[PDB]
With several copies, the nearest count.
Chain A
Amino acid sequence: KILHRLLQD
Chain B
Amino acid sequence: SLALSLTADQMVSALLDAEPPILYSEYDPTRPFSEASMMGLLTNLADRELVHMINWAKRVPGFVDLTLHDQVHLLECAWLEILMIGLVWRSMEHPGKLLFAPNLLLDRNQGKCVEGMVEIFDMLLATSSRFRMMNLQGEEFVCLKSIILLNSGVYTFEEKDHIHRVLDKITDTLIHLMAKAGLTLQQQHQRLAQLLLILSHIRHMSNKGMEHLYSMKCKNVVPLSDLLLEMLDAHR
- Contact (Cβ within 8 A) A4 B227: no
Known: A7-B54, A7-B58. A2 touches B227 (CB 8 A): yes
Interface residues as binary, B211-236 with A (CB distance below 8 Å gives 1, 0 otherwise): 00000000000000011001100000
| Complex: chain B residue closest to A8, CB-CB | B68
| Complex: chain A residue closest to B66, CB-CB | A7
Interface residues as binary, A1-9 with B (CB distance below 8 Å gives 1, 0 otherwise): 111101111
Q: List 25 A-B contacts (CB under 8 A).
A: A1-B72, A1-B230, A2-B227, A2-B230, A3-B54, A3-B72, A3-B75, A3-B76, A3-B227, A3-B230, A3-B231, A4-B68, A4-B72, A6-B51, A6-B54, A6-B55, A6-B227, A7-B54, A7-B57, A7-B58, A7-B71, A7-B72, A7-B75, A8-B68, A9-B55
**Shortest beta-carbon distance, A3 to chain B, in Å?**
5
Interface of B is mostly: helix
| Complex: chain B residue closest to A2, CB-CB | B227
Q: What are the 7 A-B residue pairs with the smallest beta carbon separation, nearest first?
A: A2-B227, A6-B54, A3-B72, A7-B71, A1-B230, A4-B72, A2-B230
**Shortest beta-carbon distance, A2 to chain B, in Å?**
4
Give the contact-size bracket for chain B: 10 to 19
Chain B residue numbers with a CB within 8 Å of A2 are 226-227, 230
B interface residues with partner A (beta carbon < 8 Å): 51, 54-55, 57-58, 68, 71-72, 75-76, 226-227, 230-231
Q: How far is the CA of A2 from the CA of B82 in the complex (A)?
A: 18
Chain B residue numbers with a CB within 8 Å of A6 are 51, 54-55, 227
**Shortest beta-carbon distance, A8 to chain B, in Å?**
7
Chain A residue numbers with a CB within 8 Å of B72 are 1, 3-4, 7
Q: How far is the CA of A7 from the CA of B227 in the complex (A)?
A: 12
**Shortest beta-carbon distance, B126 to chain A, in Å?**
22
Chain B residue numbers with a CB within 8 Å of A1 are 72, 230
Chain A residue numbers with a CB within 8 Å of B57 are 7
Q: How far is the CA of A2 from the CA of B76 in the complex (A)?
A: 11
**Shortest beta-carbon distance, B231 to chain A, in Å?**
7
**Shortest beta-carbon distance, A6 to chain B, in Å?**
5
Q: How far is the CA of A4 from the CA of B51 in the complex (A)?
A: 12
Q: How far is the CA of A6 from the CA of B54 in the complex (A)?
A: 7
| Complex: chain B residue closest to A3, CB-CB | B72
